[PDB]
Design a protein around this ligand. Structure first.
Ligand SMILES: O=P(O)(O)O[C@H]1[C@H](OP(=O)(O)O)[C@@H](OP(=O)(O)O)[C@H](OP(=O)(O)O)[C@@H](OP(=O)(O)O)[C@H]1OP(=O)(O)O
Lengths: 530, 501
């Protein structure tokens, strides 16, 4: 339902040391928090946030008493985020000239979480750390720390200047900070972090250590706070006798901006003043208004117009049989072309939660579908009032789980049959052999994958599905800038956005020459008239 | 855009003779096909006009008064009365009705038939966008006894093609086999773009000829014509088309209570905000967050969604293996070269397509439909052309535009440990599924809502006794597969399900 998060910035002097060609890590982490809190504020979620700093010249921890946890300031307690937080983080925060043990910061954070979650649901608790591990520390309490974390069930993530493992364009994909440039204090810090986190989250733990530049192009910050979807209970039936209790979830759904714009007066900035009226009239000459009681709902049937009352519509409208997920048959996976996918979502189908019998049956079905390389054609009806759909269900096996995937398929009415002239049989368009060689050379240069370790695996050099919507970030930044600088114009797009929206410089550099060759070998000119 | 079609149909003794009892009358093929195309047009709610003319008739009817020519309909939008008129002729009973009222079998010159058709087009008033005439026949040498008639038909066809008409010949299965080479090779509207040695085969099945005619008749409706930018320098022009589109139920319109006149709002009256009216410049856009209000100009609103000029810019190439199918986001689009803007584009397009197919890799581009729209990452999947056994354009050559979800669109799966199944259960399911294997043609399932609603509208418009309750194909034939399954289901259940459930 409701989560609670606290952010642990390093504001240390070492944290702010900009090697030329790279921004100061303090600035990068500032950008990361800016993004995160922007999302939180403009998502208007109910999850309160807290901010604690270490490396400050002063200290404000509740445990600062006793001459410990010094240089640690609790800048903001667990409250709902606000524009004031944004203003403080962009302006009020300045790089402190102090270095402190981040473990002490963890102690302060766990204290804060324990002492501020009182009387609040807080279905989730999680902590982020933005440090460089450049400062030494004491390995004393870390055992107590991890024990308390396990007892209190507190998630954890680590963010560093460099990833675990040309110009270091922030937010780029390929390159990163020189792995050999680390000071070997960061080596020890990394070892401690790795062992702590592996103790916490197991072998998957080392998957939660992100570099700031890498962080900006991922949603890993929200990975531990996002409200999981809600299942859709239903049964699928093969024939009459056979049925299985299952649940389904929306795995892909086009995210959309929540709050639309509101038109208001230029003078009083009020939507209340403005409103719209309308009149109804016959389309014939001598336009005479038509009052609503002289208006009846009608329908067009080609050249024909038929009156049709809404009551008659309801009485004659098609009526389904209610929620259902029945199957129809099976066909070659080859038959179902990937391009015929229709609809605007996908459904991953799981065995109904906590049912060994359903799990066994569904797993057997999935394995049979896979081995036969078949797919299932189903009749899907979300609700009795919804239009029933027909779509393909195909097995999707995985090491840790297995599930069916459903995608709506189209009816004949949605198809369009256009005739296209072929290209291979076009004597005016057949490319020359040299042209083909040039194209092949380009496509070799402009590759995006790479066979790695000769393990025949293919490491992507550009995961687009890991990139989030740049529109949300741009919108949030513009809104925040206006909210803080009302008279100022809109700031341009941040450079790192263009970085994440572009392939690594290596492919472009290698493609420079073949592109020129193609430009020479393919005469292209515009059409002027017409 | 507003075009028209003429379904010219021959009425001869061959047209009423069935090759086999299982086979249906070619005339029946034609009339049912015409009913199909009208109902499809009504569903699509297009503006194209249509008309039907018969020749070889014992009794003629036409303005210009040529014998054996029956202008049964004038160019017009489809109407329910027209549909009933057509349905009056389907089936053997309808064939007998056609014999009695129309009468079939008579000499004729194709030249005068085309002359009548040209006159009928001349009768139009609106801007007729295209000019298509589709012929239905199983006779390959109409003027095997009248050489002068054949020559006159040849010259008339040449003129009409020069005039701007398109004539398309839907030949039918006949004893001996139709061959366009004998007479129509110079008659048909052969596309000058390429050598149409490839051509549709003899039509025998109603579904097959229906696919043929529907594919032939329509015109490509370019959704958009963008520029594919390889870099700042290399650029080509392509036409984004959509092959699938959810046919929503047509919206209702308001009507006068008594006269049933199509009424019009013709009014968007403002308030006293500015007094009666209001200037758009006085309308700033704002949004509220917490106790804070943020206000922007409309131009400012358009500005923050600006990333780059509309079009496709290429970032790189990726093997199809790395790309997934379960990562569906929205209906895919289709891409075809467009040399009406940049010359030589199709050459590069074709070379690139061939090389991508050879390498089994797809292009990855940054889509941008129109001005000031945030981009999506899309994969250009090469799509090799495929032809049916009947020479049907099953799969158009070109690049299939596929949207790729953003990390925001991606959701996580809450789950505990999974459980496998015993191999015997898997084999039982394999047998069960094999008992239900069936080939799937994409043109198999109709939307029940659309059909039922249109049946209701038909019954109201035709003032029938009751609306026909259209059967649903989507609803499973539960008893049918129960029969097809036998006792396998019970054995599987006892293998898996516990005695209590
Ligand atoms: O990085 P990839 O090899 O392309 O694998 C991704 C990635 O998984 P991993 O990085 O852990 O292998 C996704 O995880 P997220 O980055 O979205 O957190 C995962 O999603 P889940 O862990 O939720 O299953 C997704 O799987 P899918 O798209 O099936 O949901 C999966 O791709 P694969 O399906 O190829 O493993």
């Amino acid at each position: 339902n409701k989560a609670a998060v606290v952010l642990c910035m390093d504001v240390g002097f070492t944290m702010s040391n900009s090697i030329p060609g790279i921004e100061s890590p303090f600035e990068q982490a500032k950008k990361v928090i800016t993004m995160f809190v922007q999302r939180q504020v403009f998502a208007e979620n109910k999850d309160e946030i807290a901010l604690v700093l270490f490396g400050t010249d002063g200290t404000d921890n509740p445990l600062s008493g006793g001459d410990q946890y010094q240089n640690i300031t609790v800048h903001r307690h667990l409250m709902l985020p606000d524009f004031d937080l944004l203003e403080d983080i962009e302006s009020k925060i300045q790089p402190g000239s102090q270095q402190a043990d981040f473990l002490d910061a963890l102690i302060v954070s766990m204290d804060v979480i324990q002492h501020e979650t009182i009387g609040k649901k807080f279905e989730k608790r999680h902590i982020e750390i933005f440090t460089d591990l450049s400062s030494r520390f004491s390995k004393s309490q870390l055992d107590i720390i991890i024990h308390s974390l396990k007892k209190c069930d507190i998630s954890l993530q680590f963010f560093l200047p460099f990833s675990l493992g040309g110009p270091f364009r922030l937010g780029g994909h390929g390159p990163s900070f020189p792995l050999k440039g680390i000071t070997e204090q960061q080596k020890e810090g990394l070892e401690i972090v790795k062992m702590v986190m592996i103790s916490l989250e197991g072998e998957d733990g080392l998957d939660e250590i992100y570099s700031f530049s890498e962080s900006l192009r991922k949603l890993c910050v929200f990975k531990k706070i996002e409200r999981h979807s809600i299942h859709w209970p239903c049964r699928l039936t093969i024939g009459s006798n056979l049925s299985i209790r299952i649940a389904a979830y929306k795995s892909i759904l086009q995210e959309r901006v929540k709050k639309t714009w509101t038109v208001v007066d230029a003078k009083t900035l009020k939507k209340e003043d403005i409103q719209k009226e309308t009149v109804y009239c016959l389309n014939d000459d001598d336009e005479t208004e038509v009052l609503k009681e002289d208006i009846i709902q009608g329908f067009r049937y080609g050249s024909d117009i038929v009156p049709f009352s809404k009551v008659d519509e309801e009485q004659m409208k098609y009526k389904s049989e209610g929620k259902c997920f029945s199957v129809l048959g099976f066909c070659k996976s080859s038959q179902v072309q990937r391009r015929f996918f229709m609809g605007n979502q996908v459904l991953k189908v799981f065995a109904a939660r906590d049912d060994e019998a359903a799990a066994v049956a569904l797993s057997s079905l999935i394995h049979a579908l896979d081995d036969l390389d078949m797919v299932a054609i189903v009749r899907y009806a979300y609700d009795k009032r919804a239009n029933p759909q027909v779509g393909v269900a195909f097995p999707h096996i995985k090491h840790n789980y297995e599930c069916l995937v459903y995608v709506q398929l189209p009816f004949m009415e949605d198809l369009r049959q256009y005739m296209f002239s072929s290209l291979k049989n076009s004597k005016k368009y057949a490319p020359t052999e040299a042209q083909l060689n040039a194209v092949d050379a380009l496509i070799d240069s402009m590759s995006l994958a790479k066979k790695d370790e000769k393990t025949d695996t293919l490491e992507d050099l550009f995961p687009t599905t890991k990139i989030p919507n740049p529109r949300f970030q741009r919108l949030f930044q513009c809104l925040l800038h206006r909210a803080l600088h009302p008279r100022e114009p809109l700031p341009p797009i941040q450079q790192h956005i263009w970085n994440m929206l572009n392939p690594p410089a290596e492919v472009t550099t290698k493609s420079q020459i073949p592109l020129s060759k193609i430009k020479t070998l393919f005469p292209l000119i515009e059409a002027k008239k017409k | 855009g507003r075009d028209s079609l003429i379904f010219l149909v021959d009425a001869s003794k061959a047209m009423f003779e069935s090759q086999s009892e299982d086979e249906l009358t070619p005339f029946d093929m034609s009339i049912q096909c015409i009913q199909s195309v009208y109902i499809s047009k009504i569903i699509s709610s297009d503006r194209d006009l249509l008309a039907v003319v018969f020749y070889g008739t014992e009794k003629d009817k036409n303005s210009v008064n040529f014998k054996n020519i029956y202008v049964l309909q004038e160019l017009d939008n489809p109407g329910a009365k027209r549909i009933l008129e057509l349905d009056q002729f389907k089936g053997q009973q309808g064939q007998k009705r056609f014999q009695d009222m129309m009468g079939h079998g008579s000499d004729y010159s194709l030249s005068e038939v085309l002359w009548v058709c040209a006159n009928l087009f001349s009768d139009v008033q609106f801007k007729m966008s295209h000019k298509r005439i589709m012929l239905f026949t199983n006779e390959d040498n109409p003027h095997g006894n009248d050489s002068a008639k054949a020559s006159r038909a040849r010259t008339k066809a040449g003129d009409l093609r020069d005039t701007g008409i398109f004539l398309d010949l839907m030949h039918l299965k006949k004893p001996g086999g139709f061959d366009i080479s004998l007479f129509y090779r110079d008659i048909i509207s052969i596309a000058e773009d390429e050598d149409l040695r490839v051509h549709f085969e003899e039509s025998s099945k109603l579904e097959d000829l229906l696919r043929k005619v529907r594919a032939k008749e329509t015109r490509k409706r370019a959704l958009s014509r963008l520029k594919l930018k390889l870099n700042k320098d290399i650029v080509i022009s392509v036409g984004i088309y959509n092959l699938v589109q959810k046919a929503l139920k047509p919206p209702p319109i308001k009507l006068y209570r008594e006269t049933n006149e199509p009424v019009k709002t013709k009014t968007r009256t403002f308030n006293t905000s500015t007094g009666g009216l209001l200037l758009p410049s006085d309308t700033k856009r704002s949004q509220i967050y917490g106790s804070r209000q943020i206000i922007l100009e409309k131009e400012e609103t358009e500005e923050l969604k600006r990333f780059d000029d509309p079009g496709l810019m290429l970032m790189g190439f990726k093997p199809l293996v790395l790309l997934k199918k379960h990562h569906y986001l929205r209906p895919s689009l289709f891409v075809y070269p467009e040399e009406s803007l940049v010359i030589g584009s199709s050459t590069l397009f074709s070379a690139l397509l061939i090389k991508c197919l050879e390498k089994e890799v797809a292009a990855l581009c940054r889509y941008t439909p129109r001005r000031n729209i945030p981009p999506y990452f899309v994969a250009l999947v090469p799509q090799e052309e495929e032809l049916d056994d009947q020479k049907i354009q099953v799969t158009p050559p070109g690049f299939q535009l596929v949207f790729l979800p953003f990390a925001d669109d991606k959701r996580k799966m809450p789950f505990t440990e999974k459980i496998m199944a015993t191999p015997e259960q898997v084999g039982k399911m394999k047998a069960i599924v094999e008992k239900l294997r069936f080939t799937y043609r994409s043109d198999s399932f109709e939307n029940p809502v659309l059909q039922q609603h249109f049946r209701n509208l038909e019954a109201l418009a035709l003032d029938l006794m009751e609306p026909e309750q259209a059967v649903d194909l989507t609803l499973p034939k539960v008893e049918a597969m129960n029969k097809r399954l036998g006792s396998l289901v019970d054995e599987f259940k006892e293998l898996v399900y516990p005695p209590d459930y």
